[PDB]
Design a protein around this ligand. Structure first.
Ligand SMILES: O=C(O)[C@H]1Cc2ccccc2CN1S(=O)(=O)c1ccc(-c2ccccc2)cc1
Ligand SMILES: [Ca+2]
Ligand SMILES: [Ca+2]
Ligand SMILES: [Zn+2]
Ligand SMILES: [Zn+2]
Length: 165
């Protein structure tokens, strides 16, 4: 695992998040469940607690955007970059954006939203990319069974390094 340069991290353990919009590819409940379970992966290996809010200012904004979307990191259409997130901090800090032009799924087909969201949240919490090819924080996407998914040991090591002892 690798911690993001500067070691940015949340100084509060209860964080809020808000799903700002949706993707036509899945139902709203499917998007909400993928996000909830993605946060839960990290939650069960750290002292962090995530609370969803329906409107208002949340610590972590989550949204689906296309191409230019106000942050100087434009998406690129189908495939290629799937999503991105900002390191812990105020404002844009911690926010996770997903490329609206992707085929988002809750299956083994590209691209499983739950898995991509889980990876992005690692960034939102302060983790950089791992060089362990089996880590959720590895730089390239790959499907893994999701029904009873749990964080690979390397990611546990990483989150414990930040929010542990
Ligand atoms: O890394 C990112 O967040 C973004 C932005 C970025 C910025 C700098 C360098 C590389 C990348 C690559 N991408 S990405 O869209 O191609 C990507 C997204 C998810 C996963 C993944 C890995 C394992 C399991 C499930 C999903 C991998 C890559
Ligand atoms: Ca893309
Ligand atoms: Ca934020
Ligand atoms: Zn963005
Ligand atoms: Zn990444």
């Amino acid at each position: 695992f690798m911690l993001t340069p500067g070691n940015p991290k949340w100084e509060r353990t209860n964080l809020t998040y808000r799903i700002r919009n949706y993707t036509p590819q899945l139902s709203e409940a499917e998007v909400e469940r993928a996000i909830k379970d993605a946060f839960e992966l990290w939650s069960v290996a750290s002292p962090l607690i995530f609370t969803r809010i329906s409107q208002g200012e949340a610590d972590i904004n989550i949204a689906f955007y296309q191409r230019d979307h106000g942050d100087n990191s434009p998406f690129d259409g189908p495939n290629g970059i799937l999503a991105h997130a900002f390191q812990p901090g105020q404002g844009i800090g911690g926010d996770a954006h997903f490329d609206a032009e992707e085929t988002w799924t809750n299956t083994s087909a590209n691209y499983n939203l739950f898995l991509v969201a889980a990876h992005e949240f690692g960034h939102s919490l302060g983790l950089a990319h791992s060089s362990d090819p089996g880590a959720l924080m590895y730089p390239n996407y790959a499907f893994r069974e999701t029904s009873n998914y749990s964080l690979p040991q390397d990611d546990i090591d990483g989150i414990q390094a930040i929010y542990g002892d």
